[PDB]
Design a protein around this motif. Structure first.
Motif, PDB file in Angstrom:
ATOM      1  N   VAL A 188       0.837  -1.224   0.000  1.00  0.00           N
ATOM      2  CA  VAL A 188       0.000   0.000   0.000  1.00  0.00           C
ATOM      3  C   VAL A 188       0.870   1.272   0.000  1.00  0.00           C
ATOM      4  N   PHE A 189       2.009   1.283   0.733  1.00  0.00           N
ATOM      5  CA  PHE A 189       2.929   2.469   0.661  1.00  0.00           C
ATOM      6  C   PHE A 189       3.492   2.710  -0.744  1.00  0.00           C
ATOM      7  N   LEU A 190       4.043   1.710  -1.358  1.00  0.00           N
ATOM      8  CA  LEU A 190       4.654   1.853  -2.692  1.00  0.00           C
ATOM      9  C   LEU A 190       3.614   2.216  -3.746  1.00  0.00           C
ATOM     10  N   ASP A 191       2.374   1.664  -3.567  1.00  0.00           N
ATOM     11  CA  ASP A 191       1.306   2.050  -4.521  1.00  0.00           C
ATOM     12  C   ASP A 191       0.900   3.534  -4.260  1.00  0.00           C
ATOM     13  N   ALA A 192       0.932   3.929  -3.013  1.00  0.00           N
ATOM     14  CA  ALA A 192       0.667   5.323  -2.714  1.00  0.00           C
ATOM     15  C   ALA A 192       1.671   6.239  -3.432  1.00  0.00           C
ATOM     16  N   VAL A 193       2.938   5.966  -3.196  1.00  0.00           N
ATOM     17  CA  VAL A 193       4.044   6.630  -3.932  1.00  0.00           C
ATOM     18  C   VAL A 193       3.859   6.634  -5.473  1.00  0.00           C
ATOM     19  N   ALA A 194       3.437   5.455  -6.050  1.00  0.00           N
ATOM     20  CA  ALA A 194       3.296   5.298  -7.488  1.00  0.00           C
ATOM     21  C   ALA A 194       2.154   6.199  -8.021  1.00  0.00           C
ATOM     22  N   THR A 195       0.984   6.222  -7.351  1.00  0.00           N
ATOM     23  CA  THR A 195      -0.108   7.101  -7.756  1.00  0.00           C
ATOM     24  C   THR A 195       0.315   8.540  -7.674  1.00  0.00           C
ATOM     25  N   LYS A 196       0.979   8.949  -6.637  1.00  0.00           N
ATOM     26  CA  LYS A 196       1.353  10.355  -6.554  1.00  0.00           C
ATOM     27  C   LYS A 196       2.335  10.762  -7.665  1.00  0.00           C
ATOM     28  N   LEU A 197       3.504  10.127  -7.708  1.00  0.00           N
ATOM     29  CA  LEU A 197       4.450  10.398  -8.753  1.00  0.00           C
ATOM     30  C   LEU A 197       3.745  10.398 -10.115  1.00  0.00           C
ATOM     31  N   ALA A 198       2.873   9.410 -10.338  1.00  0.00           N
ATOM     32  CA  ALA A 198       2.154   9.313 -11.652  1.00  0.00           C
ATOM     33  C   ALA A 198       1.340  10.648 -11.914  1.00  0.00           C
ATOM     34  N   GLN A 199       0.650  11.149 -10.903  1.00  0.00           N
ATOM     35  CA  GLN A 199      -0.227  12.322 -11.121  1.00  0.00           C
ATOM     36  C   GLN A 199       0.579  13.630 -11.366  1.00  0.00           C
ATOM     37  N   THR A 200       1.660  13.871 -10.620  1.00  0.00           N
ATOM     38  CA  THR A 200       2.375  15.106 -10.899  1.00  0.00           C
ATOM     39  C   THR A 200       3.260  15.041 -12.126  1.00  0.00           C
ATOM     40  N   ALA A 201       3.831  13.829 -12.474  1.00  0.00           N
ATOM     41  CA  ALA A 201       4.499  13.584 -13.738  1.00  0.00           C
ATOM     42  C   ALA A 201       3.533  13.694 -14.937  1.00  0.00           C
ATOM     43  N   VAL A 202       2.245  13.457 -14.730  1.00  0.00           N
ATOM     44  CA  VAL A 202       1.338  13.637 -15.820  1.00  0.00           C
ATOM     45  C   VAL A 202       1.072  15.081 -16.138  1.00  0.00           C
ATOM     46  N   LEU A 203       1.163  15.933 -15.147  1.00  0.00           N
ATOM     47  CA  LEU A 203       1.035  17.367 -15.378  1.00  0.00           C
ATOM     48  C   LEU A 203       2.271  17.897 -16.200  1.00  0.00           C
ATOM     49  N   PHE A 204       3.520  17.671 -15.749  1.00  0.00           N
ATOM     50  CA  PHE A 204       4.660  18.071 -16.500  1.00  0.00           C
ATOM     51  C   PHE A 204       4.701  17.461 -17.856  1.00  0.00           C
ATOM     52  N   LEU A 205       4.344  16.191 -17.965  1.00  0.00           N
ATOM     53  CA  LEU A 205       4.405  15.535 -19.268  1.00  0.00           C
ATOM     54  C   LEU A 205       3.484  16.311 -20.242  1.00  0.00           C
ATOM     55  N   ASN A 206       2.246  16.505 -19.803  1.00  0.00           N
ATOM     56  CA  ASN A 206       1.170  17.100 -20.709  1.00  0.00           C
ATOM     57  C   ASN A 206       1.639  18.450 -21.237  1.00  0.00           C
ATOM     58  N   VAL A 207       2.155  19.271 -20.368  1.00  0.00           N
ATOM     59  CA  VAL A 207       2.541  20.579 -20.837  1.00  0.00           C
ATOM     60  C   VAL A 207       3.741  20.428 -21.791  1.00  0.00           C
ATOM     61  N   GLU A 208       4.830  19.882 -21.296  1.00  0.00           N
ATOM     62  CA  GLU A 208       6.070  19.838 -22.066  1.00  0.00           C
ATOM     63  C   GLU A 208       5.906  18.999 -23.336  1.00  0.00           C
ATOM     64  N   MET A 209       5.862  17.669 -23.183  1.00  0.00           N
ATOM     65  CA  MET A 209       5.978  16.747 -24.397  1.00  0.00           C
ATOM     66  C   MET A 209       4.825  16.820 -25.300  1.00  0.00           C
ATOM     67  N   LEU A 210       3.621  16.641 -24.712  1.00  0.00           N
ATOM     68  CA  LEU A 210       2.419  16.713 -25.515  1.00  0.00           C
ATOM     69  C   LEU A 210       2.315  18.059 -26.271  1.00  0.00           C
ATOM     70  N   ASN A 211       2.389  19.205 -25.556  1.00  0.00           N
ATOM     71  CA  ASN A 211       2.113  20.469 -26.282  1.00  0.00           C
ATOM     72  C   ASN A 211       3.149  20.628 -27.373  1.00  0.00           C
ATOM     73  N   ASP A 212       4.459  20.377 -27.032  1.00  0.00           N
ATOM     74  CA  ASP A 212       5.493  20.482 -28.045  1.00  0.00           C
ATOM     75  C   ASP A 212       5.177  19.553 -29.290  1.00  0.00           C
ATOM     76  N   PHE A 213       4.528  18.456 -29.056  1.00  0.00           N
ATOM     77  CA  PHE A 213       4.243  17.574 -30.186  1.00  0.00           C
ATOM     78  C   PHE A 213       3.158  18.202 -31.067  1.00  0.00           C
ATOM     79  N   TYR A 214       2.152  18.807 -30.398  1.00  0.00           N
ATOM     80  CA  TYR A 214       1.119  19.493 -31.158  1.00  0.00           C
ATOM     81  C   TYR A 214       1.627  20.651 -32.001  1.00  0.00           C
TER      82      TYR A 214
END
Lengths: 50, 50, 50
Positions: B10-36
């Protein structure tokens, strides 16, 4: 000239850093070119026209 | 949660969900927008040079 | 050669008439180039991406 040469070299490396820093904070480093802008605005218009 | 060391899963999954959610914000702006913005340009040049 | 020159010149004028006429009815005399088709399907592709 040569005496000034090194102190000029150091100031130049600095102003290159700061130029980078504003290129980072205000533009997010988005590189730009004249033909690029032209190509994208053209395509937004041709989308509009589609 | 006070016994984290007894429940690694449950701790490591907690860590995984969090990292996943804030990395999705940086990803969307940087990589995705640049691809568009950069994808149309590279299509047009590459089709020209082909 | 000088004698056949006549019937061959008639028959050449004939086969130029027939091709021309086909060009009016099957393609409306519409100008076409490889590039034009390529540009037009390119822009369709761009709209979809959008």
């Amino acid at each position: 000239m040569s005496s000034k040469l090194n102190e000029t070299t150091e100031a130049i490396q600095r102003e290159l850093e700061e130029t980078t820093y504003q290129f980072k904070v205000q533009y997010n480093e988005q590189p730009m070119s004249a033909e690029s802008y032209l190509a994208a605005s053209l395509d937004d218009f041709k989308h509009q026209f589609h | 949660l006070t016994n984290k060391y007894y429940c690694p899963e449950v701790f490591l999954d907690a860590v995984a969900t969090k990292l996943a959610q804030t990395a999705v914000l940086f990803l969307n702006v940087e990589m995705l927008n640049d691809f568009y913005v950069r994808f149309p340009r590279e299509v047009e040049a590459k089709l020209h040079e082909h």
